[PDB]
């Protein structure tokens, strides 16, 4: 189960990196981006 948790953590980290690279070149972040970022950070906090 530990390795499965690590695997999901790696997939989630890759998705968060993709989201950051989407938002890297923009000055501001809109409400949808903040909402999805908050959801992803909550899931990552639970996994940690």
């Amino acid at each position: 189960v530990i390795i499965s948790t690590v695997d999901y953590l790696l997939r989630l980290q890759e998705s968060i990196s993709d989201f950051y690279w989407y938002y890297s070149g923009k000055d501001i972040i809109d409400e949808s981006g903040q909402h999805n970022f908050s959801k992803a950070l909550a899931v990552t906090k639970q996994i940690f």
Binding site: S17, Y22, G25
Partner: protein, 218 residues
């Protein structure tokens, strides 16, 4: 290590089944006079020496796809991952491997030429690495000895081996071909003063004499 990193000198090797015998070839190109790529045979190295001077490429960058898009819109050592876009620089000429818009294949009308270009501009020089089977997956580290699939970013075409009546060529096609990436020199070691393979040397006898021939003209 068992993983490919950047600033590493590698060769790209492929296998073609000709006359019920497997023959190994390496991707090669010259700098001056002819910028197009060819395949140097390396199976019969015991009888005829291969010319691996022109087969060496250096892994410059191994960016992600979104990172590549951001870098192209804006304009040290990291392990290569599946699904990443890499930049290949010819070790001898200093040029970059580029999917060319010109074509010369009579068999395949949809194939493009692959060659060398002086500058690394645009999507035409970046190649995405993909696994050959289900044993690997995207985001995994590329291991030494794996079979890779190289896809052009600009044209969405595989780097492909074409066999025609015994003739062997390389082009950017819509059919895939597996490539082996054998490292020739790891970039972690930066020691100097010691004899490495593929070095060009002078063999001095004492302090003034050296090994020579009378004339270059044959």
């Amino acid at each position: 290590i068992q993983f490919l990193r950047t600033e590493d000198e590698v060769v790209l090797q492929c296998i073609a089944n000709i006359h019920k015998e497997q023959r190994k070839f390496c991707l090669a190109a010259e700098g001056l006079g002819n910028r197009l790529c060819f395949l140097e045979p390396t199976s019969e190295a015991k009888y005829v020496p291969p010319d691996l001077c022109v087969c060496n490429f250096v892994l410059e960058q191994s960016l992600s796809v979104r990172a590549l898009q951001e870098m192209l819109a804006n304009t040290g050592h990291r392990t290569l991952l599946y699904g990443h876009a890499i930049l290949l620089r010819h070790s001898f000429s200093g040029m970059y491997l580029t999917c060319l818009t010109t074509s010369r294949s009579q068999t395949d009308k949809l194939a493009f030429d692959v060659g060398l270009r002086e500058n690394a501009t645009g999507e035409a020089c970046w190649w995405t690495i993909h696994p050959a089977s289900k044993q690997r997956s995207e985001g995994e580290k590329v291991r030494i000895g794996d079979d890779l699939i190289l896809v052009s970013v600009s044209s969405e075409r595989y780097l492909h081996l074409s066999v025609s009546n015994g003739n062997v060529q390389v082009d950017a096609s819509f059919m895939q071909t597996l490539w082996n990436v054998h490292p020739t020199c790891s970039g972690s070691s930066i020691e100097e003063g010691y004899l490495l393979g593929g070095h060009v040397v002078r063999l001095f006898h004492g302090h003034d004499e050296c090994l020579t021939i009378p004339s270059t003209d044959q």
